[PDB]
Design a protein around this ligand. Structure first.
Ligand code: HEM
Ligand code: HEM
Ligand SMILES: CNCCCc1cc(F)cc(CCc2cc(C)cc(N)n2)c1
Ligand SMILES: CNCCCc1cc(F)cc(CCc2cc(C)cc(N)n2)c1
Ligand SMILES: C[C@H](O)[C@H](O)[C@H]1CNc2nc(N)[nH]c(=O)c2N1
Ligand SMILES: C[C@H](O)[C@H](O)[C@H]1CNc2nc(N)[nH]c(=O)c2N1
Ligand SMILES: [Cl-]
Ligand SMILES: [Cl-]
Ligand SMILES: [Gd]
Ligand SMILES: [Gd]
Ligand SMILES: [Zn+2]
Lengths: 401, 401
């Protein structure tokens, strides 16, 4: 039972929950790979039993009739067809628990308030699109953002799967040039490549929302244009720097991850897009200022008349903060839900104390919880964390080509 | 071998050096404990042979006559005495290599330029103090700082250890109040209490330099005052915020870690203080802004007329940026060596490239290498790292009290 210390306060806890963390991570006694982004019939029943077990644990119903009754049919279902079907409340419980278990998510204080849209009765590429469009409309909710996951059907051996080919529902275009440089988002060129070679006529500039390459089992993907009315976007302005608006920056309202594999009770859902709301550093610091994304830092510094001829003027730092200020200001002005990295990390600390009492600890990935600016000014920086893998969970998966 | 990616640029390396990791860390395939701050003759023999092989590799005479002679000599001296002695050139190489292997040091581009003072003939605490004064005088060098280490007698059987009780050579006192409060540096309350308990007449200021507590073998510690004129300090001012000077803030020139253990070829040196020069965030962000340290952030933000009622104004981020500006400005003005987090992380990137060429990898602790502000604005942020323990090495050791 690992001893965990907070270095700001001096408080100590023990992670007893770590004792039940199985699917091995990348670290060995001889080397730590904690900073790596991607770490390198009898079975389906084992992962199914334990999931059912914790479901009834939660609702005080272990030592029941319904417990072993539910235990009995799942094995019967796998005995007959080789897989099994989840009860809707199980699917809901599984969805929320997965979020609860995501080591890298700083927003988990909200894990209990999640809207699950059951799309398991899906059968083609146009029905998927309609589900996604319901999701986006509901989640966006005219700027009052609501967490949501849409679960598409469980993958089954033989015959293919549903996959959203975009990493998010809303992504901006990345266009190659006569040279190699990119107008738009350099993160999303692999997909912009495929959007055109499947037959989308490429737009003009830096902020073109991409079409959804949606794919139903076996038969290849098909493109879908998003309704401009559905895609809520926020123009970026600065509260006191009048020229910032002229930079012509925008970002979308809805962070919706569409390439991760949802795994519940040994069942694998290649298509299960979840969505919440942005932490402002995500947009302002990583999306806009990363050298390999929009890379705008220098441009804003020039506008602020900053001395870019010496690193020691801290011009990078100064311009980064103002970019973040603009993001917060613009989203608030547009009445779109957003949280600053101080509020967010403080809620995470609160989440940590909750999970300590409820579950005896919490899987947390330090490098991802600590925000990309002003890290030691937030309370999570001085908090040791234990990282490990619990089920149910979201996992990464291969790109469907 | 572990594959490692730079996400800023797309680079890919493999850390083969990790395979020779002569020791084991806190992580298991079950759980990563990376974020945790604190993670006979036959084995003494194999440790020594390892280091001798290293030394004769470095001078390009592996497997030679002189090499096998030394091996035989060491095996012989461990037989007669249970220990052995380092040659001076072996000691210099071993001290550099210990710096080179230190996973949490961002300053390792410099590892080759280290001044090694051999104090292994030291015989008392009074002599110890003379050796330390010379170290401080040499390393400080009127503001033009030079990297150095002084090596005191090794751990030996039958005799106690030389120890410096102070965690650094220069520390400010931390006096408890009856607000429950601390006046001065809260990180130094315990060592301050020790000093008083050992006869020191305490001051009452916020920046009172502590006396040294030096322990000769099988002796109580002895108190020694540093001459005021040996301790170079830097009053802190801001280039455009003139009220900043009225805060009465100061910091010292010389960062000299004195409580770590140096291990070379199985031999242990419980007292071997080493010093470099500061990276500005150590002072600006950690020492002055940590809520459990000097904690000046709010008072600065208030003086800056920022809105400290709400977090989304990013008052914390703005106050901290200016505190770091003040530090950089002040040291440059005082002509005292200092490096900003941009230059330092940039040179560490070059170090990683050097080390991959030279040794096939580099032990590095992401969470300590990434600066405490502006993390993703530095190139180390997007660099995956492998953390592991190579010897020779600096290790933590328990406090002597
Ligand atoms: C409601 C407010 C939410 C906030 C403020 C938030 C914030 C964040 C942030 C900042 C990250 C870091 C990822 C990165 O920077 O690359 C993250 C990751 C993650 N989040 Fe959340 N999130 C929210 C909602 C959700 C929801 C609703 C789910 C699932 C139902 C979720 C699951 C995850 C997962 C699985 C990751 C890991 C991503 C990866 O490995 O690339 N989060 N979250
Ligand atoms: C010359 C310029 C140097 C710079 C800029 C530098 C930079 C740093 C920084 C920023 C840290 C992080 C510690 C913290 O934030 O609390 C660190 C740790 C460390 N440094 Fe360096 N350093 C320098 C010189 C040296 C030298 C000369 C040695 C040894 C010969 C050394 C050995 C170490 C060790 C062992 C640690 C980790 C100590 C711990 O974890 O408590 N450094 N260094
Ligand atoms: C190859 N893909 C690997 C990276 C995946 C990823 C990157 C990223 F910057 C951001 C995300 C999602 C971040 C997120 C997700 C959600 C649901 C809410 C929120 N505020 N933020 C994922
Ligand atoms: C035992 N507790 C673990 C952390 C110890 C520690 C604290 C600290 F403030 C500073 C350091 C070393 C900082 C340092 C050391 C040196 C030699 C140069 C430089 N720029 N910075 C260590
Ligand atoms: C708990 C956490 O690991 C701890 O506070 C670490 C994080 N990273 C750090 N990095 C550096 N350079 N110095 C530090 O003191 C710390 N503190
Ligand atoms: C190398 C490093 O592990 C990698 O760049 C990680 C670090 N932490 C991160 N944290 C978040 N939230 N998002 C990221 O993309 C990264 N990148
Ligand atoms: Cl994003
Ligand atoms: Cl310090
Ligand atoms: Gd102008
Ligand atoms: Gd002024
Ligand atoms: Zn690890």
């Amino acid at each position: 039972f690992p001893r965990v210390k907070n270095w700001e306060v001096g408080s100590i806890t023990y992670d007893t929950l770590s004792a039940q963390a199985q699917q091995d991570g990348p670290c060995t006694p001889r080397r730590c790979l904690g900073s790596l982004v991607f770490p390198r019939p009898e079975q389906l029943l084992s992962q199914a039993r334990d999931f059912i077990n914790q479901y009834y644990s939660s609702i005080k119903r272990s030592g029941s009739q319904a417990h072993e009754q539910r235990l009995q049919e799942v094995e019967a279902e796998v005995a007959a067809t080789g897989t099994y079907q989840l009860r809707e409340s199980e699917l809901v419980f599984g969805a929320k628990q997965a979020w609860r278990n995501a080591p890298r998510c700083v927003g988990r204080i909200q894990w209990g308030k999640l809207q699950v849209f059951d799309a398991r009765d899906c059968r083609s590429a146009q029905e998927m699109f309609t589900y996604i469009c319901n999701h986006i409309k509901y989640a966006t909710n005219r700027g009052n953002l609501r967490s949501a996951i849409t679960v598409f059907p469980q993958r089954c051996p033989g015959r293919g799967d549903f996959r959203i080919w975009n990493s998010q529902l809303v992504r901006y275009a990345g266009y190659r040039q006569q040279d190699g440089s990119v107008r738009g988002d350099p993160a999303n060129v692999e997909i912009t490549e495929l959007c055109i070679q499947h037959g989308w006529t490429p737009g003009n500039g830096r902020f073109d929302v991409l079409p959804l390459l949606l794919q139903a089992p076996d038969e290849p993907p098909e493109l879908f244009l998003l309704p401009p009315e559905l895609v809520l976007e926020v123009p970026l302005e600065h509260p006191t720097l009048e020229w910032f608006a002229a930079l012509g920056l925008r970002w979308y309202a809805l962070p919706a991850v569409s390439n991760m594999l949802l795994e519940i009770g040994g069942l694998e859902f290649p298509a299960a897009p979840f969505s919440g709301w942005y932490m402002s550093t995500e947009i302002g610091t990583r999306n806009l200022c990363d050298p390999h994304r929009y890379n705008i830092l220098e441009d804003v510094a020039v506008c602020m008349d900053l001395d870019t001829r010496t690193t020691s003027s801290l011009w990078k730092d100064k311009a980064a903060v103002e970019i973040n200020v603009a993001v917060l200001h613009s989203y608030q002005l547009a009445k779109v839900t957003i949280v600053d990295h101080h509020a967010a990390t403080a809620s995470f600390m609160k989440h940590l104390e909750n999970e300590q009492k409820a579950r005896g600890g919490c899987p947390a990935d330090w490098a991802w919880i600590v925000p990309p600016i002003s890290g030691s000014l937030t309370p999570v920086f001085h908090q040791e964390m234990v990282n490990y893998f619990l089920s149910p969970a979201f996992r990464y998966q291969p790109d469907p080509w």
